[PDB]
Amino acid sequence: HPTFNKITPNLAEFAFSLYRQLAHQSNSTNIFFSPVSIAAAFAMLSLGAKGDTHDEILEGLNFNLTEIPEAQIHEGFQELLRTLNQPDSQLQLTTGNGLFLSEGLKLVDKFLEDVKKLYHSEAFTVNFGDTEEAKKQINDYVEKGTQGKIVDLVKELDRDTVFALVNYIFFKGKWERPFEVKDTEEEDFHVDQVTTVKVPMMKRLGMFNIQHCKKLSSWVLLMKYLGNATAIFFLPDEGKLQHLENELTHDIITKFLENEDRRSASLHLPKLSITGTYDLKSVLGQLGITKVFSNGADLSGVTEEAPLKLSKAVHKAVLTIDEKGTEAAGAMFLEAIPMSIPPEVKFNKPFVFLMIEQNTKSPLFMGKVVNPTQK
């Protein structure tokens, strides 16, 4: 049952979609979005809205309902809900289709025995007359759930809001063959020639799967996590955005993410903890999930009474990786860390990255560190 197959390509190709719809509306905001809280909570709603509805939901979510059957796509995720959700080992995490309804409805207990069975989607009741104990329940649940990483996100609320959303997350990562928190010294990573920095870097000399392809033309780094996830790094040439950002494919990565070779040049690295909150109502329109949060439709194909609409969806993907580990260095690699081959990996210039999945090929977080004043 390679269930993930039907969704793994037709979703990774979705990553580049919303990446350049930020790297389209900006040259200022730091990117840390989860091609998961989006492509999921807006396809996991191929249950709680039917007809011409999820012909915007999982119609937009790359999958082509003529190429691949809907009802034969709902486990592709419960193997991204049980392959990448089953009580972890190292990776852990805490994303969650929190969900947020109004006290006043009736919904479908069976639609609920669809989204909850498979996507687990946690459902409950909450009056929106008084718009604070919905907060004393939402960003409370991105605190009650996120183990405290999206401890805000919600600042305002309306006195109606029924079919709202939640996808909190308490990531996890480290290195099996680690880093030295003691090579770590804050050094010059530089953004613009206006934002020339003095970033809190790190250091080491592994035998890194680092290439410098003509394809995308940059620094293609690879790192090994602690629980079957294979981080990726990248690092632009000299005026780079596009070519990569633009001519980047699934395949571009398939064959970087594939191999397992050697090297030995000097790794530089500014610190990771760049959080990044993104609301779906704001970009999913120009994208295409129009009438889904519209003034009215068949969102009452999850209830029937009081003509439901979509309140909103959000994702403050929190980063939880940087240098921790165990196999250490000890001594041999305590010099063998600033042991460049001739070059370096001076992460002194604004790059991108991503997180693939050894139990799939899932992009947990795509990005492009702009400048750590925003992290």
From Swiss-Prot:
Q: How is it modified after translation?
A: N-glycosylated. Differential glycosylation produces a number of isoforms. N-linked glycan at Asn-64 is alternatively di-antennary, tri-antennary or tetra-antennary. The glycan at Asn-27 is di-antennary with trace amounts of tri-antennary. Glycan at Asn-228 is exclusively di-antennary. Structure of glycans at Asn-27 and Asn-228 is Hex5HexNAc4. The structure of the antennae is Neu5Ac(alpha1-6)Gal(beta1-4)GlcNAc attached to the core structure Man(alpha1-6)[Man(alpha1-3)]Man(beta1-4)GlcNAc(beta1-4)GlcNAc. Some antennae are fucosylated, which forms a Lewis-X determinant. (Microbial infection) Proteolytically processed by Staphylococcus aureus seryl, cysteinyl, and metallo-proteases.
What biological-process terms (Gene Ontology) are attached? acute-phase response; blood coagulation
Impact noted for substituting residue 339 to R: In Pittsburgh; has antithrombin activity; inhibits factor VIIa activity; causes fatal bleeding diathesis
Expression by tissue, per the entry, reads: Ubiquitous. Expressed in leukocytes and plasma.
Q: What is the effect of changing residue 343 to T?
A: In L-Offenbach
Q: What does this protein do?
A: Inhibitor of serine proteases. Its primary target is elastase, but it also has a moderate affinity for plasmin and thrombin. Irreversibly inhibits trypsin, chymotrypsin and plasminogen activator. The aberrant form inhibits insulin-induced NO synthesis in platelets, decreases coagulation time and has proteolytic activity against insulin and plasmin.
Recorded protein name is Alpha-1-antitrypsin
List the source organism: Homo sapiens
